[PDB]
Amino acid sequence: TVAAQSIGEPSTQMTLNTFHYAGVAEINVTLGLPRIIEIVDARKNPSTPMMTVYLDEEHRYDRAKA
Amino acid sequence: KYTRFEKARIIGARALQISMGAPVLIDVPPGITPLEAAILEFEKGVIPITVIRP
Amino acid sequence: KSSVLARAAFEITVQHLFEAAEKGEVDNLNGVIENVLIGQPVPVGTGMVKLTMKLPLRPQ
Amino acid sequence: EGGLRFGEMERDVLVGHGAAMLLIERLLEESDKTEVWVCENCGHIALEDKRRRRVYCPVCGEEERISKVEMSYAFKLLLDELKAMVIRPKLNLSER
Amino acid sequence: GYRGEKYYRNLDEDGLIFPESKVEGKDVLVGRTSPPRFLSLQERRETSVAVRPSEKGVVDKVIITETGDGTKLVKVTVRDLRIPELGDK
Amino acid sequence: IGRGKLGEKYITIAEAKELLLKRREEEVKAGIEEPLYYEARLALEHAERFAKLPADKAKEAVEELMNAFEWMSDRIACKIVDIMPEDSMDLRVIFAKEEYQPTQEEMKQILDILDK
Amino acid sequence: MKKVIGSIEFGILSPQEIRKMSAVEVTVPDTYDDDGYPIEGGVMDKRMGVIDPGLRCETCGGRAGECPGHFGHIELARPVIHVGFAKTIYRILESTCRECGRIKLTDEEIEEYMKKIELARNRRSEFNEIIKEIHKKAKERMVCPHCGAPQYPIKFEKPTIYWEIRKDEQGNEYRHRLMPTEVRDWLEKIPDKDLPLLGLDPEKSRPEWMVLTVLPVPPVTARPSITLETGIRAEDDLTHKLVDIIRINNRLKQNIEAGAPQLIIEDLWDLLQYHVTTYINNEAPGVPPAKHKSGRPLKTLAQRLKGKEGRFRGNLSGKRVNFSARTVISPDPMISINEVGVPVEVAMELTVPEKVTEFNIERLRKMVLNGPDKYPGANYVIDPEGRRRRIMDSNKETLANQLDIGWTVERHLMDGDIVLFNRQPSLHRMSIMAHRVRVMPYRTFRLNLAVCPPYNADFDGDEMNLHVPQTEEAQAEARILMEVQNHIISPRYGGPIIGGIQDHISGGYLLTREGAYFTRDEVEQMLM
Amino acid sequence: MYKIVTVKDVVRIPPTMFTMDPKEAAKIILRETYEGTYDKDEGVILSILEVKDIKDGIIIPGDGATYHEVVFDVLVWEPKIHEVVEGYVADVMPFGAFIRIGPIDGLVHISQLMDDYVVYDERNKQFVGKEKKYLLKIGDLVRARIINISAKSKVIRENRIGLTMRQPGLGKFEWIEKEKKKEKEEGKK
Numbered sequence A: 001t002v003a004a005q006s007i008g009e010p011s012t013q014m015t016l017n018t019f020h021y022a023g024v025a026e027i028n029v030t031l032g033l034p035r036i037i038e039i040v041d042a043r044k045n046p047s048t049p050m051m052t053v054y055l056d057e058e059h060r061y062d063r064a065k066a
Numbered sequence B: 001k002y003t004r005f006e007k008a009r010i011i012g013a014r015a016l017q018i019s020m021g022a023p024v025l026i027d028v029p030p031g032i033t034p035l036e037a038a039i040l041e042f043e044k045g046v047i048p049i050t051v052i053r054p
Numbered sequence C: 001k002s003s004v005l006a007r008a009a010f011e012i013t014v015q016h017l018f019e020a021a022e023k024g025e026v027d028n029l030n031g032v033i034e035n036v037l038i039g040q041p042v043p044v045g046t047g048m049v050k051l052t053m054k055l056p057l058r059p060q
Numbered sequence D: 001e002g003g004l005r006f007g008e009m010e011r012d013v014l015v016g017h018g019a020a021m022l023l024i025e026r027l028l029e030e031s032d033k034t035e036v037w038v039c040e041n042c043g044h045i046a047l048e049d050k051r052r053r054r055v056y057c058p059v060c061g062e063e064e065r066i067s068k069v070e071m072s073y074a075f076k077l078l079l080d081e082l083k084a085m086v087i088r089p090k091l092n093l094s095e096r
Numbered sequence E: 001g002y003r004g005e006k007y008y009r010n011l012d013e014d015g016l017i018f019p020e021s022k023v024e025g026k027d028v029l030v031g032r033t034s035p036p037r038f039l040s041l042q043e044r045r046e047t048s049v050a051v052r053p054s055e056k057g058v059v060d061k062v063i064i065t066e067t068g069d070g071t072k073l074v075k076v077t078v079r080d081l082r083i084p085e086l087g088d089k
Numbered sequence F: 001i002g003r004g005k006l007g008e009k010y011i012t013i014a015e016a017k018e019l020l021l022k023r024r025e026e027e028v029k030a031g032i033e034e035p036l037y038y039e040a041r042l043a044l045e046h047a048e049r050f051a052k053l054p055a056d057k058a059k060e061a062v063e064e065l066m067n068a069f070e071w072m073s074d075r076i077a078c079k080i081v082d083i084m085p086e087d088s089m090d091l092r093v094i095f096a097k098e099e100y101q102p103t104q105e106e107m108k109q110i111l112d113i114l115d116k
Numbered sequence G: 001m002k003k004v005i006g007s008i009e010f011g012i013l014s015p016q017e018i019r020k021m022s023a024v025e026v027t028v029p030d031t032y033d034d035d036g037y038p039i040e041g042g043v044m045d046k047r048m049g050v051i052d053p054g055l056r057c058e059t060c061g062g063r064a065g066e067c068p069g070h071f072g073h074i075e076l077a078r079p080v081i082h083v084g085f086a087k088t089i090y091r092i093l094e095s096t097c098r099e100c101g102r103i104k105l106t107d108e109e110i111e112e113y114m115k116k117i118e119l120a121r122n123r124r125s126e127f128n129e130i131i132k133e134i135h136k137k138a139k140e141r142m143v144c145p146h147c148g149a150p151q152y153p154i155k156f157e158k159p160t161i162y163w164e165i166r167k168d169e170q171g172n173e174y175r176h177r178l179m180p181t182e183v184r185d186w187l188e189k190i191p192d193k194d195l196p197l198l199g200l201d202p203e204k205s206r207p208e209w210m211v212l213t214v215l216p217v218p219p220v221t222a223r224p225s226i227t228l229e230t231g232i233r234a235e236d237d238l239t240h241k242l243v244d245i246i247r248i249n250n251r252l253k254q255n256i257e258a259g260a261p262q263l264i265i266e267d268l269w270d271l272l273q274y275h276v277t278t279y280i281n282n283e284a285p286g287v288p289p290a291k292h293k294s295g296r297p298l299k300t301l302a303q304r305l306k307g308k309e310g311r312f313r314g315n316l317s318g319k320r321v322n323f324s325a326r327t328v329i330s331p332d333p334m335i336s337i338n339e340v341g342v343p344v345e346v347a348m349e350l351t352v353p354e355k356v357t358e359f360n361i362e363r364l365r366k367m368v369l370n371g372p373d374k375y376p377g378a379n380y381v382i383d384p385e386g387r388r389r390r391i392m393d394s395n396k397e398t399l400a401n402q403l404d405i406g407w408t409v410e411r412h413l414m415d416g417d418i419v420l421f422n423r424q425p426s427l428h429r430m431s432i433m434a435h436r437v438r439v440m441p442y443r444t445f446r447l448n449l450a451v452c453p454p455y456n457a458d459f460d461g462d463e464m465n466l467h468v469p470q471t472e473e474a475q476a477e478a479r480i481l482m483e484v485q486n487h488i489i490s491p492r493y494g495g496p497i498i499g500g501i502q503d504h505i506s507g508g509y510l511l512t513r514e515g516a517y518f519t520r521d522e523v524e525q526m527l528m
Numbered sequence H: 001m002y003k004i005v006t007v008k009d010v011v012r013i014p015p016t017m018f019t020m021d022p023k024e025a026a027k028i029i030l031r032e033t034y035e036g037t038y039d040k041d042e043g044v045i046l047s048i049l050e051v052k053d054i055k056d057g058i059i060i061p062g063d064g065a066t067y068h069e070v071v072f073d074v075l076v077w078e079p080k081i082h083e084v085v086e087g088y089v090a091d092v093m094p095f096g097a098f099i100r101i102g103p104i105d106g107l108v109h110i111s112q113l114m115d116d117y118v119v120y121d122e123r124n125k126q127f128v129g130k131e132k133k134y135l136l137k138i139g140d141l142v143r144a145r146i147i148n149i150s151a152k153s154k155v156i157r158e159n160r161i162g163l164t165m166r167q168p169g170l171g172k173f174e175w176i177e178k179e180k181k182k183e184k185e186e187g188k189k
């Protein structure tokens, strides 16, 4: 019960509109309370799927090779 | 040693026993309430109730 | 959750109740919500402590 | 002269504090509580007759084993509502 | 259903409260009896209209009228002074 | 019966006459008006009606009856002590309830075991 | 002596159980006569209990507030399908043979699936998956393996309509409808040996019990009529629906006895089925809900057990309580953080029962002498026998002298008492804490300012509730577990939750800033 | 029949008797719980002789008292069907004679005393001899086989025991002596 309340209580302080900004280097993704609801409900397919791909040692530090 | 749940349970049992007519095991100031009498008995170390732990 | 009453109190009560009637499910009242519904101490916190005492108590 | 609502969120707060006896005090004595006759042979609630000063179980005709049970009145109403449908909730008693 | 004689202290013989008389909680404003209920018999239920249980003030005016069906209708207004205190918004 | 009965032992009417007298003495030493509570004073009258046979020697006769033959149960033994039979008809009748009937030579020997 | 409920086992009521547990059979579709007494044999027959004052229930004596209630029963003219079990009935029908009633499975496959089921079927999801697999397997066989007979497909039409797609001459089906009596006869001949394969239980339930022929009647105390201010009895929705059901049943019985045409009997049967399915659940899919005289939808048994205002969430998980008070809050920095200011008006209304002992006799005697009007007084005394006496001005000294060991006094609140202090919504566990009572003249609760953040409260019109524990164990729990000074550190992040806010921080900065200096009088006064 | 049995049970020691030793306080509590009680499967409970062993007390929530498991022995007079009972007739009443057999009183119906036609006195209200002239008195102690036992309730009331006399070997000691004389005469002839 303490864990359930410690998760629920801050959820009244998060935002809904997120940021909605691109900034070239960033991809728009859902954030705030809807993201937490998605994670807890374990949706089969998230609204904004995204992956973070790490390059191997080769091409990792070179911009053109990346 | 004691968890706060055990302490609360012991004090609650002692207070009810004292209220129902059990004698107090330590001298108390006049006019005190049974709950405070049980709390006094407790911090004075005179507790006749023990807790079962597996 | 194994308890019928715990699931019933959450959502879609009638479907759970009728399904439990069909299956002949048995609720052992091992949880918190069912015990609160009955009106007997819950098995958490002070509700799980067990006490004993030596009877021949003599005042000091 | 109504009473204040003691919401289920308050009950969850009480559980989170671990105060079981405070919870039972708030939820039974202050609001509703009653004693019923339960026939442990078949689980059905027995009938107490104030004419004969006698307790007996109508559904199975048992008078030997009729134990006293303490429960909320609202739960008895819930049991009656379930028995209003074809639901049959059997009650298994235990000591202590 | 007859409540205490204390609560009929401020009534007139016609069953209506005297204006400018100070009242307290659950004091009877209009005394009225109703036909009995068959569970008794040869009785009259007490159905007086009384002040709200926690309110207090002074009776300001009493009005006697006739409804759309000719039945008597009585309206009583109670005024209460409210000096500012702690908790007022 | 209280939850979980365990044990059983049959005793003579004289074997409890003295116990009922014990209740009589402790209750009066406690100052209770009745020498012993209801259903026990009347039972004491019932005991003293034919409590002439000594209790200890009643148990002695009982144990000798066990040693005499194995079919005998202590209840039957104390019953035999507390009847004091005189002729065959007596034991035939008192055993007529029992599945087993007593032999007449068994009569003659339990006559010796009975003594007074 | 006293036993507790150890477990609850559910099931389905058999007609024999309903008949035996009932107290009376209902035959008259009316509640009250002209004068106001219950009509003999009506839906408000006194056999089920008494709700009107000055009436004794002949079943168990009692009074309006004493008689608990007794169940009635209605003998339905013809069986009807229970709406809660209709989907299950469809699941069963298309998985068993029409002739022998056996499960349409092969014996070795039955053995394999019985072996599978016994492997911890208590897990509901796995049991459901296994039963779904069995249903899918039994769906796709046109011919029974146990006996030689063709099996026609069955179409389920909501809410309780079953069609049988059976062929005819020139190879054309006519979608025969299955009457409830035919369905009950089909279900009845199912053997118990394969009931676990269908997800049922041979003892707690039976397939033929799901089609009900006798309908239990709830007790009168479960259907309380309200005497409206106009003097007209306002019947509960359930009572009205029962009246309709009895009227339809009586009409059906009369028509059957009179040899009515088949179509009329079918229409009456459908009407009775509709009335029953609305009474059990007025929000059942595929039906127009029954409506009150005012046009509002009726509330029935299924409605009482659902929703935020329903039984489970409105009267079981939460309820209204006694010994509680509510008023606005106002700041008070002069009291300790573990103390709450209580109005004197509230203190003389709420009471804390206390037992008379050798160490508190004189104080209780003084309070009893003070009466129920002086502030440190009392309102009731309870003798050791258990009788309740109200303290009045003519009883003060007599009851004070009668007072002795073993008595109970319902004294007014005092300084140092423990109470529960709550703000809604109860978002997290430190929304409710225990405070020490400190009596105050005015009519607002006084709360220390450092305790605001846990309650998320500001003094702009907020109202907060107060509760008084009534038993010694509850008071001990509140005193030991719920003290305010225990919860300085928040459990969410291990940091303080109670602390200085606003003016506290500003004054601290003003005091400790560089260049701040104070004189003799200022230092002495501030330290004092 | 008098019989001593041992039974375990749980005892609710109230806080008022916490000071005294557990055994005697138990004893009194057992006395109050069942001193004047007659069991269906045991008989009329007479006396809790002594508590053999007392266990510790478990503090159940709500009550606050101590519950101790105990083992004790109690002597119980157990009536048995088809049994001779050597009691004396307490009173007589024209459906049946009442013979006192212990804590309960046994009933000897008029049509079940003696093979002779059903007869019972009215002026003396004890018994009238039709053909046998075979008088049973209120102070005389008799033995009688039992036909039935009325196990109804534990309040030692509404319970009666049927005792037959028609069978041989029962009755007033005088007529038993007369039957013994007849047996002696037949054995001597």
Ligand SMILES: [Mg+2]
Binding pocket: G457, G458, G459, G460, G461, G462
């Ligand atoms: Mg606010």
Ligand SMILES: [Zn+2]
Binding pocket: D039, D040, D041, D042, D043, D044, D057, D058, D059, D060, D061, D062
């Ligand atoms: Zn039963």
Ligand SMILES: [Zn+2]
Binding pocket: G047, G048, G049, G050, G057, G058, G059, G060, G061, G062, G067, G068, G069, G070
């Ligand atoms: Zn009733």
Ligand SMILES: [Zn+2]
Binding pocket: G097, G098, G099, G100, G101, G102, G144, G145, G146, G147, G148, G149
């Ligand atoms: Zn077949």
